[PDB]
Amino acid sequence: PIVQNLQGQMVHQCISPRTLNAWVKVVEEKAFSPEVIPMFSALSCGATPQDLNTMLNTVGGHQAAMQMLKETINEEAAEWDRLHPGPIAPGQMREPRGSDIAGTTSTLQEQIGWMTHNPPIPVGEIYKRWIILGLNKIVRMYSPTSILDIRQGPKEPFRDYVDRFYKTLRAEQANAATETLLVQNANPDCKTILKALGPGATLEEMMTACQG
Amino acid sequence: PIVQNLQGQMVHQCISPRTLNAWVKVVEEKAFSPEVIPMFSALSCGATPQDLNTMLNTVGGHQAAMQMLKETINEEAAEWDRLHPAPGQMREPRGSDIAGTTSTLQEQIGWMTHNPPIPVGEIYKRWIILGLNKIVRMYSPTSILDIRQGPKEPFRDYVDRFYKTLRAEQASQENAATETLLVQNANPDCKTILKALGPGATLEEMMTACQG
Amino acid sequence: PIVQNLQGQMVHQCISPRTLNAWVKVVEEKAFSPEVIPMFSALSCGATPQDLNTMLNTVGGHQAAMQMLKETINEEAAEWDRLHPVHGQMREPRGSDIAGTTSTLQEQIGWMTHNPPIPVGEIYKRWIILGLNKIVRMYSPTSILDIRQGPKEPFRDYVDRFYKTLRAEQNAATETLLVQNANPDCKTILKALGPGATLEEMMTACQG
Amino acid sequence: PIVQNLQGQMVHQCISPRTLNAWVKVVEEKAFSPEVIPMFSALSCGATPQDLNTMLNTVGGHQAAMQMLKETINEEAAEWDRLHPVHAGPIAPGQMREPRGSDIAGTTSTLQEQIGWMTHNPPIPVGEIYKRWIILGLNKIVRMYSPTSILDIRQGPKEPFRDYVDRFYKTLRAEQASQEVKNAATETLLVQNANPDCKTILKALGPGATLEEMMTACQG
Amino acid sequence: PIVQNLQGQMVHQCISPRTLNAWVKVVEEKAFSPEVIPMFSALSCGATPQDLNTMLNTVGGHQAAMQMLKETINEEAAEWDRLHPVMREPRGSDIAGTTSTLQEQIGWMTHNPPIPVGEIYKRWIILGLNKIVRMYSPTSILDIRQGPKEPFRDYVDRFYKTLRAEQASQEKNAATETLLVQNANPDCKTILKALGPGATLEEMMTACQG
Amino acid sequence: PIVQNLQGQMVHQCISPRTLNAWVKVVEEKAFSPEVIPMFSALSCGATPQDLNTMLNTVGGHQAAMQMLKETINEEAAEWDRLHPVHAGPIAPGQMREPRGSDIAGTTSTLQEQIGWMTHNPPIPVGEIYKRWIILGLNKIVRMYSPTSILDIRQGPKEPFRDYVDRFYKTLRAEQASQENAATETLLVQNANPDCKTILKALGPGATLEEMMTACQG
Numbered sequence A: 001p002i003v004q005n006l007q008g009q010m011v012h013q014c015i016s017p018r019t020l021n022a023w024v025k026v027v028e029e030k031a032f033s034p035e036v037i038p039m040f041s042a043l044s045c046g047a048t049p050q051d052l053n054t055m056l057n058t059v060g061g062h063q064a065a066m067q068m069l070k071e072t073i074n075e076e077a078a079e080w081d082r083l084h085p086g087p088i089a090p091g092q093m094r095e096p097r098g099s100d101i102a103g104t105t106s107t108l109q110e111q112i113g114w115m116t117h118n119p120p121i122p123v124g125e126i127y128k129r130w131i132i133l134g135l136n137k138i139v140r141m142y143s144p145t146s147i148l149d150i151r152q153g154p155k156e157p158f159r160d161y162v163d164r165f166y167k168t169l170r171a172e173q174a175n176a177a178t179e180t181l182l183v184q185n186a187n188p189d190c191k192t193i194l195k196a197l198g199p200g201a202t203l204e205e206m207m208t209a210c211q212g
Numbered sequence B: 001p002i003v004q005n006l007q008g009q010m011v012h013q014c015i016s017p018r019t020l021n022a023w024v025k026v027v028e029e030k031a032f033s034p035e036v037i038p039m040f041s042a043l044s045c046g047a048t049p050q051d052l053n054t055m056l057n058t059v060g061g062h063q064a065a066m067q068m069l070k071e072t073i074n075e076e077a078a079e080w081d082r083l084h085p086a087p088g089q090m091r092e093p094r095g096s097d098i099a100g101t102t103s104t105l106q107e108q109i110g111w112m113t114h115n116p117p118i119p120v121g122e123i124y125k126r127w128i129i130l131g132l133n134k135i136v137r138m139y140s141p142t143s144i145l146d147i148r149q150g151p152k153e154p155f156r157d158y159v160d161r162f163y164k165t166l167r168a169e170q171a172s173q174e175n176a177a178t179e180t181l182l183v184q185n186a187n188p189d190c191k192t193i194l195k196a197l198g199p200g201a202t203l204e205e206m207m208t209a210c211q212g
Numbered sequence C: 001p002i003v004q005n006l007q008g009q010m011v012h013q014c015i016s017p018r019t020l021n022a023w024v025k026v027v028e029e030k031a032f033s034p035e036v037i038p039m040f041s042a043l044s045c046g047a048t049p050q051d052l053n054t055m056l057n058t059v060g061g062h063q064a065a066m067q068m069l070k071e072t073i074n075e076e077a078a079e080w081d082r083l084h085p086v087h088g089q090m091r092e093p094r095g096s097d098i099a100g101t102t103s104t105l106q107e108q109i110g111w112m113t114h115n116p117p118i119p120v121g122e123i124y125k126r127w128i129i130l131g132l133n134k135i136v137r138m139y140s141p142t143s144i145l146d147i148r149q150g151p152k153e154p155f156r157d158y159v160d161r162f163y164k165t166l167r168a169e170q171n172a173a174t175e176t177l178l179v180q181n182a183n184p185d186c187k188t189i190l191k192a193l194g195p196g197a198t199l200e201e202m203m204t205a206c207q208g
Numbered sequence D: 001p002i003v004q005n006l007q008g009q010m011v012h013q014c015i016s017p018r019t020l021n022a023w024v025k026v027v028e029e030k031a032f033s034p035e036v037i038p039m040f041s042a043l044s045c046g047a048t049p050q051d052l053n054t055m056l057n058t059v060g061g062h063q064a065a066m067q068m069l070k071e072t073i074n075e076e077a078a079e080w081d082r083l084h085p086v087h088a089g090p091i092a093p094g095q096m097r098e099p100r101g102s103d104i105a106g107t108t109s110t111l112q113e114q115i116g117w118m119t120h121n122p123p124i125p126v127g128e129i130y131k132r133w134i135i136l137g138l139n140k141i142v143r144m145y146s147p148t149s150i151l152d153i154r155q156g157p158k159e160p161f162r163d164y165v166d167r168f169y170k171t172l173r174a175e176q177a178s179q180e181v182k183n184a185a186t187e188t189l190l191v192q193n194a195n196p197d198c199k200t201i202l203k204a205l206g207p208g209a210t211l212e213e214m215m216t217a218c219q220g
Numbered sequence E: 001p002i003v004q005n006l007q008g009q010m011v012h013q014c015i016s017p018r019t020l021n022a023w024v025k026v027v028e029e030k031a032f033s034p035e036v037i038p039m040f041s042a043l044s045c046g047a048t049p050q051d052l053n054t055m056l057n058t059v060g061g062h063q064a065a066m067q068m069l070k071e072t073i074n075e076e077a078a079e080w081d082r083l084h085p086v087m088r089e090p091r092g093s094d095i096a097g098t099t100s101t102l103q104e105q106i107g108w109m110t111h112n113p114p115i116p117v118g119e120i121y122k123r124w125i126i127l128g129l130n131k132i133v134r135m136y137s138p139t140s141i142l143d144i145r146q147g148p149k150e151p152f153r154d155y156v157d158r159f160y161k162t163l164r165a166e167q168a169s170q171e172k173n174a175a176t177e178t179l180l181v182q183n184a185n186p187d188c189k190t191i192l193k194a195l196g197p198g199a200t201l202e203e204m205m206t207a208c209q210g
Numbered sequence F: 001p002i003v004q005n006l007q008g009q010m011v012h013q014c015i016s017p018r019t020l021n022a023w024v025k026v027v028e029e030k031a032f033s034p035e036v037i038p039m040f041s042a043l044s045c046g047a048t049p050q051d052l053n054t055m056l057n058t059v060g061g062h063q064a065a066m067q068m069l070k071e072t073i074n075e076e077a078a079e080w081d082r083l084h085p086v087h088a089g090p091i092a093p094g095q096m097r098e099p100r101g102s103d104i105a106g107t108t109s110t111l112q113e114q115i116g117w118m119t120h121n122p123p124i125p126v127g128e129i130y131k132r133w134i135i136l137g138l139n140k141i142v143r144m145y146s147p148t149s150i151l152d153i154r155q156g157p158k159e160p161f162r163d164y165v166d167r168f169y170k171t172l173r174a175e176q177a178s179q180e181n182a183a184t185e186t187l188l189v190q191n192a193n194p195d196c197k198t199i200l201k202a203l204g205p206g207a208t209l210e211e212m213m214t215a216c217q218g
């Protein structure tokens, strides 16, 4: 990653072993639960495209998701070569192509130069956005149940049902329709009390009333 | 977060992997026990709104509580807007800017390091801690009125359960009214000794009298 | 806490996660064994009152001890106010300012880095260590007068229990009690040694 | 390794105990799975040849693969000597002598020489060149430890499609040394070796379907 | 500790939590084996008298040994006062940290010429810990004798591990070379004396390698 | 150890608890296997003679090997005193006194003297000199501790060829103490099983180990 030397200077640093191991352990233990994405973005703070490819490469399993990730990266790189289609002025740098942002045709020197340019170009941030777009698709794919099939059990507490509802909703959406769907699929007892509270009630109010 | 450079300038640093893992471990091992809130505040020292959202996003389960937290944040942001309705006049943040939904990292750093500053991270953390206090209270299993000393339970263990329950029910907020409930719900043998101690006794004297 | 940077100035640092975790694990492992107190003083090196309240707040159990601690802190703050009554001059802290209930972080830093300093962090830690001493003495399972060498207990094990018990509660009186509560065999060997025997001599004469 | 100073100058730092122990654990746990190679490269960021030799020396077992690695490095060193022979004679003041293949591999060079090469203006990256040779030898080891051919990866009658694709592309990664390869034949081989139920659904999708569409169709 | 900064200056740092934890675990695992002493010396690198008292205070058990350590420290402190009778020079209680503030300890340690109160106190502690390792040593060196079926390597292992606790890690002496051969089993005893005098341990062990 | 500060100067730094615990662990878990030696050299990077003695002092067991190590250090120190005699007289201003063998081994030198030699211009690397002596003794320990001989390593009946080569070069590493050949190449083919040995000769002359293990893959 490109961090800050105490001279306010932007220098390149090696990815720490602690960060490498952290990202690896997150994937092995959490698979593609929705919270893996914000953990990836946080662990890749200030990363060059080379750092992002290093992080994706250290993943041992989940090679089906990784191939899907590549196919998303290639479709975003194609769009970049459209919206931002040779001599190079002194003190300046070339313009990046989609393969340069993904790190398939660019070097660490070219990436560092783009990210420390006084007219800067954040190829690491552009690449990370493409990666997160693909990770969203993978999280949607790995979600076992649709939001429509989340229904409160007969003897299941309302808290545990809302836990499953919003965790499913997080994976899918990687609003009034969600509120109507939440009350509609509560068990018939809890359901009636939710209808009796009236509309526009906060989630805190619904859960303390359904606590019986 | 925003930290101090050896050049004396407030600079932005990436949230460390050890801090991310410590916060995830706390939530997984303690859920919403009262002591989680001070640990959250300590682990988010100097945090920007983006850093606070990263910490909240790394929470795996408890999505009912997370949605409740969003509703509290939404209400605090709305009240902030109602309470905050020149060449070079800086644009001041709205509730959504403080919460980080409509503001960039660069804008958040601008407010926090301005002269005079607007501590959007400290403001946002105040809203989060309020919502976490609500969650801790709702998650508290037992009422303080139901904490009663067992016939063979040592007085110290009873007081441990009592004050830990009181902490969850008041969400760690600050009484002889608690002293009377503590004496009233002690078992008959200890209650007699506590009555004989006279009023206004310290807790240290009370537990030394009920040790035999 | 307050540490020094590379310009000779005292700068404020965020409390570190490894320090926080170390203090939590100390309370979970050692409860209120006497050695918990010096560990607290070492982990709170340079702490502001805000940092001291953070460390105490991260304790999960032992809430009976924590309430006792608040009562000790309250009495120390009241005594500070009694000894510092109100009369270019800097405002001086109240007892609640040292304890962090009525002072902001900037006020605590301003006091701790003033010339000359008012070390509200070290004053507060003093009050806290006073309270921990009472908790450790409370948690002490047995009185020192009841620590007695078993008829088949090695003299070294008896001395280990003796001095660990004395530490939680707190010299010629202790040497008298140590010899007096030994079993009749070791007691005879210790009395035959006479006065002026070190603990090393006493433990050697009874090592059999 | 050689890292940027807080002045901003390339200085030598000792290899850290955390980096050393990390590399030892990845080999004890993962052996020579394909993802071990990008982990080796990441843990040896900025490494000198001496550092690279230290990491290779901490491997306790797998000595057959380590001898193979030595032989691969020897062939790359000989090739370096054929393309970059050292001009004999005295070295100009303020200059470094030209490195031979054994200097890059760290057998006939000192730590002080390796530092002088890597921090020279312009730098001669003896550490990066040596790591390139090491990764070439590691590619061979990954293939040797992954015997199962991609042609023998077949979805079980009740194996979930996602697990079958996991085994497929993990086997392909070892065979192809983690090299990005766009090829239609390997994507038709994936459909070809799916089980009867999913293979019917995949053919009912039509040709030229993305992996996301295929895994969604066989999600049942 | 008093350690080098980055600007070439000696400054005071707080004792590290990782250092405190390492010292606690060492005592828990090894008790008072001889190798505990060099571990204590390494973990107390640059320590002030306050840091040394902090480390000793984190020891939970072993309070019999800790009281003996206090008695050794008091003897060394009393001998310091007798050898330094009355720039205020530190008394024994100042070196041990019972009557000295942290600022006074730093004032002595960083003076020119310095008075290293941390190193002096560490010497007293190590002298006291050596007496504890010796007293807690289970066996005397004279009772280490090679088993009839015991490999010679295993006998030499027990001999020097016992001699280390006995001679409290102090330094090939003639009596120890004769005692090692004298207490070997009659078979290897013959092979050793056949080699003659002044043989290396590598030659004694290769001969009796079995 | 001696490390570089932000003034480009070499300064003394305390040895870290991570380094001490790491060295203790590799000895407890791997004794004196050949891979222990490069681990000692990496963890002692930049070490003064005092640091090197600390690491050796943290070894609890293996005291027979540690006494052999002392006798190897004593013989290297005596050879240093023969080849580098100390000259009598006062020490020139701004210079260090000449180190003798016991100074390099840290028995008669102070830490400040060790720092003085290691940071002088030009530097006398007494830590690197001492470490070489230690590694010489440790190599003699790896060979004495080695159980099997390279001659007695023969391939089993149904044992895969890769497992036989694994055991072959691991034993060879202990016999040479990580020191590195048609001699070892012919001992590898001679001590194989008759099924693979036949195919090994048919491979031809000077075949690479890759070609050899692919020829006896099954």
Ligand SMILES: O=C(Cc1c[nH]c2ccc(O)cc12)N[C@@H](Cc1cc(F)cc(F)c1)c1ncccc1-c1ccc(Cl)cc1
Residues within 6 Å of the ligand: A166, A167, A169, A170, A171, A173, B053, B054, B056, B057, B059, B063, B066, B067, B069, B070, B071, B073, B074, B099, B100, B101
């Ligand atoms: O919204 C999410 C993702 C999410 C998590 N759980 C879900 C269930 C369904 C679903 O569709 C999405 C999600 N993250 C939040 C942070 C957050 C997380 C949490 F767990 C609890 C909080 F209070 C806040 C966020 N990230 C980036 C920028 C802004 C905000 C944000 C948004 C709204 C407010 Cl009021 C404030 C900030």
Ligand SMILES: O=C(Cc1c[nH]c2ccc(O)cc12)N[C@@H](Cc1cc(F)cc(F)c1)c1ncccc1-c1ccc(Cl)cc1
Residues within 6 Å of the ligand: B163, B164, B166, B167, B170, B171, B172, B173, B174, C053, C056, C057, C059, C063, C066, C067, C069, C070, C071, C073, C074, C099, C100, C101
């Ligand atoms: O009071 C609490 C929360 C709490 C914890 N346990 C409870 C059980 C029931 C309950 O209702 C609330 C709580 N925190 C304290 C710190 C503390 C924690 C502790 F454990 C023991 C101490 F001595 C002090 C605190 N935080 C922020 C600012 C000031 C103070 C404070 C307050 C009063 C004093 Cl005298 C001093 C400081």
Ligand SMILES: O=C(Cc1c[nH]c2ccc(O)cc12)N[C@@H](Cc1cc(F)cc(F)c1)c1ncccc1-c1ccc(Cl)cc1
Residues within 6 Å of the ligand: D053, D056, D057, D059, D063, D066, D067, D069, D070, D071, D073, D074, D105, D106, D107, F169, F170, F172, F173, F176, F177, F178, F179, F180
């Ligand atoms: O040679 C060894 C020791 C060793 C290990 N295993 C053995 C089995 C028998 C045996 O006799 C000795 C040994 N280390 C190597 C590093 C290495 C280790 C490995 F595992 C695999 C590699 F490719 C390289 C080395 N160290 C210091 C300086 C230079 C070289 C070196 C040597 C030859 C090349 Cl081509 C390049 C560098």
Ligand SMILES: O=C(Cc1c[nH]c2ccc(O)cc12)N[C@@H](Cc1cc(F)cc(F)c1)c1ncccc1-c1ccc(Cl)cc1
Residues within 6 Å of the ligand: A053, A054, A056, A057, A059, A063, A066, A067, A069, A070, A071, A073, A074, A102, A103, A104, D169, D170, D172, D173, D176, D177, D178, D179, D180, D181
């Ligand atoms: O491709 C691989 C190795 C790999 C892993 N699994 C495989 C299965 C078979 C196979 O032949 C090779 C491999 N590394 C990638 C990074 C990556 C890894 C991953 F897991 C998932 C991603 F989306 C991206 C890479 N490294 C260095 C430079 C560029 C790129 C690259 C390539 C293509 C795109 Cl679109 C973008 C970047």
Ligand SMILES: O=C(Cc1c[nH]c2ccc(O)cc12)N[C@@H](Cc1cc(F)cc(F)c1)c1ncccc1-c1ccc(Cl)cc1
Residues within 6 Å of the ligand: C163, C164, C166, C167, C170, E053, E054, E056, E057, E059, E063, E066, E067, E069, E070, E071, E073, E074, E096, E097, E098
């Ligand atoms: O005295 C204690 C607490 C203690 C521990 N165990 C006990 C059993 C009963 C009991 O009443 C109190 C205690 N700490 C000591 C440090 C120490 C700890 C130890 F374990 C062994 C040592 F040699 C020294 C200390 N701390 C702060 C300042 C000065 C000294 C001090 C005191 C006397 C000497 Cl001669 C030197 C320094």
Ligand SMILES: O=C(Cc1c[nH]c2ccc(O)cc12)N[C@@H](Cc1cc(F)cc(F)c1)c1ncccc1-c1ccc(Cl)cc1
Residues within 6 Å of the ligand: E160, E161, E163, E164, E167, E168, E169, E170, E171, F053, F054, F056, F057, F059, F063, F066, F067, F069, F070, F071, F073, F074, F105, F106, F107
């Ligand atoms: O001597 C010891 C203690 C010791 C350990 N084991 C023992 C068994 C019986 C016994 O009486 C004492 C001891 N430490 C040594 C270091 C060492 C440790 C080791 F294990 C193996 C080595 F080669 C060297 C040492 N420390 C401080 C200063 C100088 C030296 C020193 C001494 C002699 C040489 Cl030639 C070189 C340095």
